Amino acid sequence: PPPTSPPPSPPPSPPPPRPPPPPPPPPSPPPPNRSPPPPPPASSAINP
Amino acid sequence: ATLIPTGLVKGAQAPTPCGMGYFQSSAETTTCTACAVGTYADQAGLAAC
Numbered sequence: 001p002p003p004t005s006p007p008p009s010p011p012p013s014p015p016p017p018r019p020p021p022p023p024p025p026p027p028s029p030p031p032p033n034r035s036p037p038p039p040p041p042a043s044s045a046i047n048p
Numbered sequence: 049a050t051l052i053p054t055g056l057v058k059g060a061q062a063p064t065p066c067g068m069g070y071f072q073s074s075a076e077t078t079t080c081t082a083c084a085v086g087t088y089a090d091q092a093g094l095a096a097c
């Protein structure tokens with residue numbers, strides 16, 4: 001007889017194990033420090 | 049006509065001291081001056097604040 005045929009080829013192998021998750025972000029910056037207020041007006045002379 | 053004087057009103061017996069916040073550097077005067085910026089007077093009767 002001729003050479004007998006081969007066996008059925010395998011199914012496609014499995015995937016890799018997939019990557020991990022991203023590390024978190026750092027704590028956000030602070031808000032711009034506010035500014036002090038305006039000095040009051042010049043007062044008048046006290047009572048005599 | 050009658051050579052008699054009638055209306056006399058007396059002056060002051062003691063001198064008033066300048067209040068706090070006021071000064072007086074003149075000798076014979078009738079008021080106080082509120083003294084200028086950058087200076088202060090924290091006692092009554094100051095010659096110069």
Ligand SMILES: *[C@H]1O[C@H](CO)[C@H](O)[C@H](O)[C@H]1O
Nearest residue numbers: 001002003004005006007
């Ligand atoms: C499987 O292969 C062999 C040889 O290659 C033979 O031809 C058979 O007929 C075939 O089924």
Ligand SMILES: *[C@H]1O[C@H](CO)[C@H](O)[C@H](O)[C@H]1O
Nearest residue numbers: 005006007008009010011
């Ligand atoms: C798939 O694999 C088999 C072996 O079982 C055979 O070599 C076939 O020819 C191939 O297509």
Ligand SMILES: *[C@H]1O[C@H](CO)[C@H](O)[C@H](O)[C@H]1O
Nearest residue numbers: 009010011012013014015
């Ligand atoms: C990956 O797996 C398949 C079967 O799923 C086959 O065995 C391949 O040879 C292997 O590399």
Ligand SMILES: *[C@H]1O[C@H](CO)[C@H](O)[C@H](O)[C@H]1O
Nearest residue numbers: 024025026027028029030
């Ligand atoms: C504040 O900053 C962090 C990173 O520093 C991140 O982007 C936040 O989304 C932001 O609100």
Ligand SMILES: *[C@H]1O[C@H](CO)[C@H](O)[C@H](O)[C@H]1O
Nearest residue numbers: 031032033034035036037
């Ligand atoms: C007012 O002052 C703050 C500082 O606390 C800051 O510089 C602002 O930019 C300014 O406008």
